[PDB]
Coordinates of C-alpha atoms and ligand atoms in Angstrom, one line a residue:
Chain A
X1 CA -4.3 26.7 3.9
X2 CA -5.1 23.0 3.4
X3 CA -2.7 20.4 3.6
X4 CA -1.3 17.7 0.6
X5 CA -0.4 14.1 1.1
X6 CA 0.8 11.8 -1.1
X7 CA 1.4 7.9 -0.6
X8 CA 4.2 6.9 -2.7
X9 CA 3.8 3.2 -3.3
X10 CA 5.9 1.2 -5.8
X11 CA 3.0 0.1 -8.1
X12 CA 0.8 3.4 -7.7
X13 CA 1.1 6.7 -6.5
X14 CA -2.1 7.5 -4.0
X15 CA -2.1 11.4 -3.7
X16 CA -5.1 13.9 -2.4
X17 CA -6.1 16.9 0.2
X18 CA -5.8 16.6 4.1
X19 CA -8.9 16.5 5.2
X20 CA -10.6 13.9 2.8
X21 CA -11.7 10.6 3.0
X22 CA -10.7 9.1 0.0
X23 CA -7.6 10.3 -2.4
X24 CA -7.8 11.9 -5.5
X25 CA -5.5 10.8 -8.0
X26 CA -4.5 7.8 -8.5
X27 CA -1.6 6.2 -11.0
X28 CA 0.9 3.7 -11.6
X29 CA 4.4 5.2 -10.4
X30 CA 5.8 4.7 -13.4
X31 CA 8.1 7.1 -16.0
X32 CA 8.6 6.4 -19.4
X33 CA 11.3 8.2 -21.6
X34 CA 12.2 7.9 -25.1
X35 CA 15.5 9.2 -26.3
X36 CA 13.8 12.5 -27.5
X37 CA 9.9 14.8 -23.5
X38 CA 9.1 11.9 -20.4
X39 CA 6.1 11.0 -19.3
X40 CA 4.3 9.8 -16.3
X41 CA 1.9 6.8 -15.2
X42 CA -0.7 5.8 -17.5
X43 CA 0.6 7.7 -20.2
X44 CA 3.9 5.8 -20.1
X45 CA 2.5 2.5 -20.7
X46 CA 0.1 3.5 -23.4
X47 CA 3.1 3.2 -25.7
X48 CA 5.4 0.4 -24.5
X49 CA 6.9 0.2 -27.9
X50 CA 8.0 4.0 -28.6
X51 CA 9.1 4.1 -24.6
X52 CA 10.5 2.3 -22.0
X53 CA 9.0 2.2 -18.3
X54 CA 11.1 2.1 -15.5
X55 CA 9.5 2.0 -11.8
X56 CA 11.6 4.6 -10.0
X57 CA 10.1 2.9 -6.7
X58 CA 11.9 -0.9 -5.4
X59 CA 9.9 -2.5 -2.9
X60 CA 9.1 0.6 -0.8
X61 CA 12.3 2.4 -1.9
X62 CA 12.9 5.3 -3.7
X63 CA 15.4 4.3 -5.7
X64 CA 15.3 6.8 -9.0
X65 CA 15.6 10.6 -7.5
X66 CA 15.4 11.7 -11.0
X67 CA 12.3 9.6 -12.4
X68 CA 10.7 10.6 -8.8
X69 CA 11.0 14.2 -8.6
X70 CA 9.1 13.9 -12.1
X71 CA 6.7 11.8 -10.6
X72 CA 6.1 14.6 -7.6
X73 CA 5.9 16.9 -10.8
X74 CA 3.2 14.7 -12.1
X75 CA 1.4 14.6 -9.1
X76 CA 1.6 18.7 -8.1
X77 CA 0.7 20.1 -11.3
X78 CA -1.6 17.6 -13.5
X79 CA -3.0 15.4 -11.4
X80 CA -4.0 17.6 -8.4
X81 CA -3.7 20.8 -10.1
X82 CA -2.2 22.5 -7.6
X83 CA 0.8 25.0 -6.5
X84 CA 2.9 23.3 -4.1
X85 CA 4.3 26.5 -3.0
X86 CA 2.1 27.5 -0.9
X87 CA 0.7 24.2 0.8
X88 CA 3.0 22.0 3.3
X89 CA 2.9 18.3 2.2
X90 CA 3.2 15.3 3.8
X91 CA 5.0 11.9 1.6
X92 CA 4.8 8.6 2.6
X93 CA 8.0 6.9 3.2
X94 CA 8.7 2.5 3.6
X95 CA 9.8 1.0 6.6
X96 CA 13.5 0.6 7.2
X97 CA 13.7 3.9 4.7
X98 CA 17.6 4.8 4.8
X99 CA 18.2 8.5 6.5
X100 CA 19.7 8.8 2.9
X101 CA 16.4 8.7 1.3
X102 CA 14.5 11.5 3.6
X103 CA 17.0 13.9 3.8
X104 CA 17.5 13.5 -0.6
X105 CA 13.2 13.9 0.2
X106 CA 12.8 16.3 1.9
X107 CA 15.7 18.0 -0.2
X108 CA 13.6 17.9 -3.6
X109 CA 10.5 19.2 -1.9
X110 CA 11.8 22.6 -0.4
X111 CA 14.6 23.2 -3.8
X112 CA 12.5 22.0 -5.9
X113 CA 9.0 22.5 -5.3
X114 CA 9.5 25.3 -2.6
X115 CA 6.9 23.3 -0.4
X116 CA 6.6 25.7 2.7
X117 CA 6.6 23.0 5.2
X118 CA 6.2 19.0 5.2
X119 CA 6.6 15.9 7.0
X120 CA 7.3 12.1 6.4
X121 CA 5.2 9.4 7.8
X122 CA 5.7 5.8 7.8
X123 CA 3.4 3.9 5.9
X124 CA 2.2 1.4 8.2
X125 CA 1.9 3.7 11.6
X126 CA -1.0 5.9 9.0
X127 CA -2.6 2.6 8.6
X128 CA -2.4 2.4 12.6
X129 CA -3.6 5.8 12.6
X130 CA -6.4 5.9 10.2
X131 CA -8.0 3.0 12.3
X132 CA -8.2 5.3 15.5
X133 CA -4.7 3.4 17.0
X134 CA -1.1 4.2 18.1
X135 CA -0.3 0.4 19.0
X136 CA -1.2 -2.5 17.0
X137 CA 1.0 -4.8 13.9
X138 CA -0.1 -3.9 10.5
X139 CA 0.5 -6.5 7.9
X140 CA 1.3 -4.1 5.0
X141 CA 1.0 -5.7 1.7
X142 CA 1.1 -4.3 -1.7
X143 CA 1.7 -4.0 -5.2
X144 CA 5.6 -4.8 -4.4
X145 CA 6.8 -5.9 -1.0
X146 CA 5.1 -7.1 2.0
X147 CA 5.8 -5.9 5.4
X148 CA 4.8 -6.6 9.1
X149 CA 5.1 -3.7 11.4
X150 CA 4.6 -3.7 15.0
X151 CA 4.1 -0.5 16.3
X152 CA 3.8 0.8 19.7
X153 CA 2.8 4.7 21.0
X154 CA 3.6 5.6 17.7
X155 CA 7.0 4.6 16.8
X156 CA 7.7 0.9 15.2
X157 CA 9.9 -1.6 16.2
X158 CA 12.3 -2.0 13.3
X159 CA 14.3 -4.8 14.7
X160 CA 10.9 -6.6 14.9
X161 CA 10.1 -5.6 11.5
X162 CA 9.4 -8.8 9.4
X163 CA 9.5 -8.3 5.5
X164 CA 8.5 -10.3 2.9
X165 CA 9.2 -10.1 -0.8
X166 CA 5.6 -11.5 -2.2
X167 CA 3.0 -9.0 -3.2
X168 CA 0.4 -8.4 -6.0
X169 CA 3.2 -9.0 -8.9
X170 CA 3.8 -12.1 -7.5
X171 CA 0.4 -12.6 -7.6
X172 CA -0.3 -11.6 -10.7
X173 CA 2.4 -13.8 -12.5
X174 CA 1.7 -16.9 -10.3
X175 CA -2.4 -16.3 -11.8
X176 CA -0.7 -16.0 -15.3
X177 CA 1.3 -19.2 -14.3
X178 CA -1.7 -21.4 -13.1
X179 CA -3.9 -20.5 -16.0
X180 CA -1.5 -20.9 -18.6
X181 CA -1.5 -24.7 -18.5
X182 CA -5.4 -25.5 -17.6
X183 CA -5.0 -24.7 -21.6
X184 CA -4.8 -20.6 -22.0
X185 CA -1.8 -18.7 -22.8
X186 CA -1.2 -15.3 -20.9
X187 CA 2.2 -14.1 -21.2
X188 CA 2.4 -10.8 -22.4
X189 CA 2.0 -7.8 -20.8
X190 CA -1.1 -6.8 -22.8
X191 CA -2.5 -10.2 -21.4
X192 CA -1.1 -9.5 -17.9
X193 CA -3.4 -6.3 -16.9
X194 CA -6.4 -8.5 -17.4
X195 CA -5.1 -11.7 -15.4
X196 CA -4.5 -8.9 -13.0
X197 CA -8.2 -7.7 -14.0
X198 CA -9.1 -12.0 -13.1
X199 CA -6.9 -11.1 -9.8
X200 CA -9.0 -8.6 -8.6
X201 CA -12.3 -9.2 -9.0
X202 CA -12.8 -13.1 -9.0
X203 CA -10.1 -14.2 -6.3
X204 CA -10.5 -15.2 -2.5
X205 CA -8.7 -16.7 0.0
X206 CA -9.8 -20.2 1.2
X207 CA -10.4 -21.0 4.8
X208 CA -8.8 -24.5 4.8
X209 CA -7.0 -24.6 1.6
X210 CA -7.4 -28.9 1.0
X211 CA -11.1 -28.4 1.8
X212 CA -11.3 -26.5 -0.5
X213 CA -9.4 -27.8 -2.9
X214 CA -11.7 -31.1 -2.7
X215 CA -15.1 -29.0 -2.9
X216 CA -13.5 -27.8 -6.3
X217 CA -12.3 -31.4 -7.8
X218 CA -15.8 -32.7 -7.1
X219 CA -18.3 -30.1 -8.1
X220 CA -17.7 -26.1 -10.5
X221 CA -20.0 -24.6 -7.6
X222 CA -17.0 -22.5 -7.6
X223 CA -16.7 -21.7 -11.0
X224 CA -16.2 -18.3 -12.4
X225 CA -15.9 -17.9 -16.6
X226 CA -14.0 -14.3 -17.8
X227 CA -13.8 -12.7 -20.9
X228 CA -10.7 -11.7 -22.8
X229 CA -11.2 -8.3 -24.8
X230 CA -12.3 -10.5 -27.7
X231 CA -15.5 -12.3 -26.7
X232 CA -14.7 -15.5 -25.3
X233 CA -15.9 -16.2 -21.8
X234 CA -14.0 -18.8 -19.6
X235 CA -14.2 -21.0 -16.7
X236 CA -11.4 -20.4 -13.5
X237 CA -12.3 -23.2 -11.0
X238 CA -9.3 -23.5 -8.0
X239 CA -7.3 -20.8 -9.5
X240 CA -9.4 -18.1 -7.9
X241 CA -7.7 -19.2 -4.1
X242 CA -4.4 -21.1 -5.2
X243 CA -3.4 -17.7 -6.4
X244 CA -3.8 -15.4 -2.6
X245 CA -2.7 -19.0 -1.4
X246 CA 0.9 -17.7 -2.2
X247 CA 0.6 -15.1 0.7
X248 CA 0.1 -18.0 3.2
X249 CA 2.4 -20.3 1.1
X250 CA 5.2 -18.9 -0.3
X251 CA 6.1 -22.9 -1.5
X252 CA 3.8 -22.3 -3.9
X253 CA 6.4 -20.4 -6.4
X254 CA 9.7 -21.6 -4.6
X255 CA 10.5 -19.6 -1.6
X256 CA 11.5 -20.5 1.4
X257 CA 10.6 -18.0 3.3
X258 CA 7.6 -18.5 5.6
X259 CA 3.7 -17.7 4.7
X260 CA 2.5 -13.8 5.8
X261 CA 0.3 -15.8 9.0
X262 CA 3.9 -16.9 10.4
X263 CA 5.7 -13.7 9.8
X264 CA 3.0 -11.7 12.0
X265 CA 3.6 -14.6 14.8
X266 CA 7.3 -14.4 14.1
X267 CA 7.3 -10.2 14.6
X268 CA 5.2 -10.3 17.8
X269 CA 7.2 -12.6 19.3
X270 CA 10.5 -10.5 19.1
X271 CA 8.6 -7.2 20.4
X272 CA 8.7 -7.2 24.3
X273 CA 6.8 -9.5 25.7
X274 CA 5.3 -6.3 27.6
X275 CA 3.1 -5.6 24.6
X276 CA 2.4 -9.0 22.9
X277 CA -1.0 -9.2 23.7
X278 CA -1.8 -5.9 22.6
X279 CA -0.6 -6.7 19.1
X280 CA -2.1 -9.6 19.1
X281 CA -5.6 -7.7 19.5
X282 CA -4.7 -5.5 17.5
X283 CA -3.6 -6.6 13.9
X284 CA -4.7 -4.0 11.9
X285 CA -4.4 -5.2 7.8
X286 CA -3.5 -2.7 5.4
X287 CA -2.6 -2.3 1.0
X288 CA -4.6 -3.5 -1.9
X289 CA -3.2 -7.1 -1.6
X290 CA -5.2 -7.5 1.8
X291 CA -8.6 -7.0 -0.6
X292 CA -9.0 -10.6 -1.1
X293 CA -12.5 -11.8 0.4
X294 CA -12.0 -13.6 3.6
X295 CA -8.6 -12.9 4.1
X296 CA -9.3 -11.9 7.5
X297 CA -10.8 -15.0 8.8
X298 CA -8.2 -17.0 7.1
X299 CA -5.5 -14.6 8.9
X300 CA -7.6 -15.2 12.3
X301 CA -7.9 -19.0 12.0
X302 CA -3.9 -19.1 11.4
X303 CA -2.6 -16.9 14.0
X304 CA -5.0 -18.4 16.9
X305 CA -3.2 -22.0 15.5
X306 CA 0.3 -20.1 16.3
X307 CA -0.1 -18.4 19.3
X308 CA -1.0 -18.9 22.5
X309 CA -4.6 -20.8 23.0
X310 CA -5.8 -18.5 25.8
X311 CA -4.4 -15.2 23.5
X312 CA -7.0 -12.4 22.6
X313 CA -6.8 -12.1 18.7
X314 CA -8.8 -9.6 17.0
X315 CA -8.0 -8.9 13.3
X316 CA -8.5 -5.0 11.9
X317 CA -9.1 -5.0 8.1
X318 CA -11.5 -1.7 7.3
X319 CA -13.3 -1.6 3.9
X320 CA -10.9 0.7 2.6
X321 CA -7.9 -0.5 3.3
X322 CA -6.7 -0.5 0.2
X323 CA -6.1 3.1 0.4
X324 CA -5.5 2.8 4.2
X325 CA -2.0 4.2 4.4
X326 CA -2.8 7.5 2.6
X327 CA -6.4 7.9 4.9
X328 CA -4.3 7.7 7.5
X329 CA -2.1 10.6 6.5
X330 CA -5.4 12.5 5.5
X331 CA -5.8 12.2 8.8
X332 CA -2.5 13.2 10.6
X333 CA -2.2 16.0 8.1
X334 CA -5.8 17.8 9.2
X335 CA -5.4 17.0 13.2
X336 CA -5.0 20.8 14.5
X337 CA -2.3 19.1 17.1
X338 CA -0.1 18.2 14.4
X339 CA 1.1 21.5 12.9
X340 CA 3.6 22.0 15.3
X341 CA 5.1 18.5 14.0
X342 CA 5.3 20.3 10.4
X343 CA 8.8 21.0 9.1
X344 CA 9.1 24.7 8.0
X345 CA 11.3 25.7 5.1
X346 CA 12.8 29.1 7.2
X347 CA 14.3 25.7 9.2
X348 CA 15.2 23.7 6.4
X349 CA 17.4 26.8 5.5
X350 CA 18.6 27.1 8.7
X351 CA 19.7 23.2 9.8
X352 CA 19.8 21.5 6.3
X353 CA 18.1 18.3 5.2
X354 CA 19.4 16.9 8.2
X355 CA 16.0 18.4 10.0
X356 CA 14.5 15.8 9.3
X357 CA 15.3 13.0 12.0
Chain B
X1 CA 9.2 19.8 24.6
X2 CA 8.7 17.6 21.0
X3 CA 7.9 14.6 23.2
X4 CA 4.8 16.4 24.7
X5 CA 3.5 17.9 21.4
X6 CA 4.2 13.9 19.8
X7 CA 1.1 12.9 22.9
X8 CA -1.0 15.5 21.4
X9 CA -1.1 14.2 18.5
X10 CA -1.5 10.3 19.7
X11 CA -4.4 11.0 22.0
X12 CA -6.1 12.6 18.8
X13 CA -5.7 9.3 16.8
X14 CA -6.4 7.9 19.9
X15 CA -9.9 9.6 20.6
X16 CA -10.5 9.4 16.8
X17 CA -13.2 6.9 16.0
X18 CA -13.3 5.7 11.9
X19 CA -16.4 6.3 10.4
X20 CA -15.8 3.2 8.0
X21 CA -18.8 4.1 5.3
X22 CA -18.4 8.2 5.3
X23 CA -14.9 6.9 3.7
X24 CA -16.4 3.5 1.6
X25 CA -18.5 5.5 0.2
X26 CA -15.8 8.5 -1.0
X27 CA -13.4 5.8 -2.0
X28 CA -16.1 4.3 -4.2
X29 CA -17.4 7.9 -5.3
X30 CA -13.9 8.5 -6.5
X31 CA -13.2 5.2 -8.0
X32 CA -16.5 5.5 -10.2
X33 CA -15.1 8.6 -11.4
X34 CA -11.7 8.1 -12.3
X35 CA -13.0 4.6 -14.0
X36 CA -15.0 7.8 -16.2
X37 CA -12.1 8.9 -17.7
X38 CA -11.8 5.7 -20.2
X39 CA -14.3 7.7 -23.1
X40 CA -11.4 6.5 -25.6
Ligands
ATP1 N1 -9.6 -6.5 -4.7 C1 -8.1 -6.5 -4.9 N2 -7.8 -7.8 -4.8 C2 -6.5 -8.2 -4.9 N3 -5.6 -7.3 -5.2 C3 -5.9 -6.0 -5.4 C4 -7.2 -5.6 -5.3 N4 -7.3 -4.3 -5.5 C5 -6.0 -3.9 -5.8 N5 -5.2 -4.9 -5.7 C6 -3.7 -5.2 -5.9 O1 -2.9 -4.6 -4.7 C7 -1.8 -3.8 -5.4 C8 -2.0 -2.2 -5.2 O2 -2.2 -1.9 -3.9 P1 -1.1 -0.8 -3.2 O3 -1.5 0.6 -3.5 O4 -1.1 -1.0 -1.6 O5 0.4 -1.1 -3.8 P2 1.6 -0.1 -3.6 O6 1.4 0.7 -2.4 O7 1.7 0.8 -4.8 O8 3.0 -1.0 -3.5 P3 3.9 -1.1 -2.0 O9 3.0 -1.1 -0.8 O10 4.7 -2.4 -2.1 O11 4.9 0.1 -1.9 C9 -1.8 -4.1 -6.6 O12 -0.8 -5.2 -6.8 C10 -3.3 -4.6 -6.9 O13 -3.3 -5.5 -8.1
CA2 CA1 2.1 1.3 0.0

């Protein structure tokens, strides 16, 4: 019997079949619910005016058990069309997920769904693992939170963790932000999804930022025109890399807290200093905010600033890291080594959620 | 005894090398199809 895993982000839920190379379904994680029954993803925002969307996932964190078991409902039975009974699944949790939150996990999935056997796997070690590694720092960035997590034979180092709370909604309102006073309003949500549309498709990551801030005040060579359902077609000069400048300058929208190129320095250098180098070769990218062009290079010519001058640094970012996380659990899920790792329901009954850990 | 079935399952990951196009080419198989689903 083939496996199911499913990657439980905060902005979209990335769920498929062990064994695959790319997921199957794909959908915001969001559930809607007017007061008469609740529905899920892309139905929810179709009608923001009869409903109202709440995002049962906070920066990694499961934090609505009743909006998320609905989700999983989603997931099972309309979106892979499939009995959950009778294949073991393996979820996705964040970093730094509280015991709390897996044992209330794997609690749903056995009473629940009646899953015969499962496992949780950190999001950041299946990035590792879906790019052949078991040590390595992934710089995890998504649609909520951005994380950097060292990992070594497997495990992470949590007190090296390094977090920070910048990701593609960030990005998304700081593009809406920037283009709303070169002279065009966008500040509803209708006008969001295609400023996020503008984010995707038409935004890189400069090299040297003032460099390239001077090619664009002197010449359009950079120049990019849109067009709004409606027509019109536009022109977007520097606001295609002052947008993913954010990531390596939080300044930009008033944090304090440091750019993504000093918080991979910052988490290597509280790991032992046993493994240092090996991270440093081995910074493996993962999430759909990494997909800006050139990111990597950008990422390479920053940390080589930081770290030592003598310091191998090789920079991982695959294609398809945007769905990374979930490969990587397509992965561990199909490896014939790992169903002895699988958590059986006759224990679940036996020990409690507590198996778990 | 979980310790030696955990080394299993790292030298696997470890010994596994990404074929980088056999999955950039499902994820954008996939993508193409689920961006089919817009008729209205
Ligand atoms: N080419 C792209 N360029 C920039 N951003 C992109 C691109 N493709 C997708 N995204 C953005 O990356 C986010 C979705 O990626 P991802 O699936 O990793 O988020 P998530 O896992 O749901 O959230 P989190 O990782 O915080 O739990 C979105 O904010 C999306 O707008
Ligand atoms: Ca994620």
């Amino acid at each position: 019997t083939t496996a199911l895993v499913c990657d439980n982000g905060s902005g979209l839920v990335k769920a498929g079949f062990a064994g695959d190379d790319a997921p199957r379904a794909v959908f915001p994680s969001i559930v809607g619910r007017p007061r008469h029954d609740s529905y899920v993803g892309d139905e929810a925002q179709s009608k923001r005016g009869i409903l109202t969307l709440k995002y049962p996932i906070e920066h990694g964190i499961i934090t609505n058990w009743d909006d998320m078991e609905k989700i999983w409902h989603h997931t099972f039975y309309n979106e892979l069309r499939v009995a959950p009974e009778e294949h073991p699944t393996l979820l996705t949790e964040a970093p730094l997920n509280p015991k709390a939150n897996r044992e209330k996990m794997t609690q749903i999935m056995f009473e629940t769904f009646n899953v015969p056997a499962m496992y949780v796997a950190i999001q950041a070690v299946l990035s590792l693992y879906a790019s052949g590694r078991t040590t390595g720092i992934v710089l995890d960035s998504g649609d909520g939170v951005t994380h950097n997590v060292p990992i070594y034979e497997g495990y992470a180092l949590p007190h090296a963790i390094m977090r920070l709370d910048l990701a593609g909604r960030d990005l998304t309102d700081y593009l809406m932000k920037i283009l709303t006073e070169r002279g065009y309003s966008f500040v509803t949500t209708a006008e969001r999804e295609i400023v996020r549309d503008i984010k995707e498709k038409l935004c890189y990551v400069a090299l040297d930022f003032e460099n390239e801030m001077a090619t664009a005040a002197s010449s359009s060579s950079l120049e990019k025109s849109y067009e709004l359902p409606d027509g019109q077609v536009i022109t977007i000069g520097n606001e295609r890399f002052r947008c993913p400048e954010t990531l390596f300058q939080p300044s930009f929208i008033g944090m304090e807290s440091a750019g993504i190129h000093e918080t991979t320095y910052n988490s290597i250098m509280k790991c032992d200093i046993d493994i240092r180098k090996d991270l440093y070769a081995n910074n493996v990218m993962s999430g759909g905010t990494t997909m800006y062009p050139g990111i990597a290079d950008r990422m390479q010519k920053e940390i080589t600033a930081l770290a030592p001058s003598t310091m191998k640094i090789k920079i991982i970012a695959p294609p398809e890291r945007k769905y990374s996380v979930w490969i990587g659990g397509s992965i561990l899920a199909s490896l014939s080594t790992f169903q002895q790792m699988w958590i059986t329901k006759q224990e679940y009954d036996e020990a409690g959620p507590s198996i778990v850990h | 005894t979980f310790n030696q079935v955990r080394e299993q399952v790292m030298v696997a990951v470890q010994s596994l090398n990404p074929d980088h196009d056999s999955r950039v080419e499902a994820i954008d198989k996939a993508e193409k199809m689920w961006e089919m689903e817009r008729k209205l």
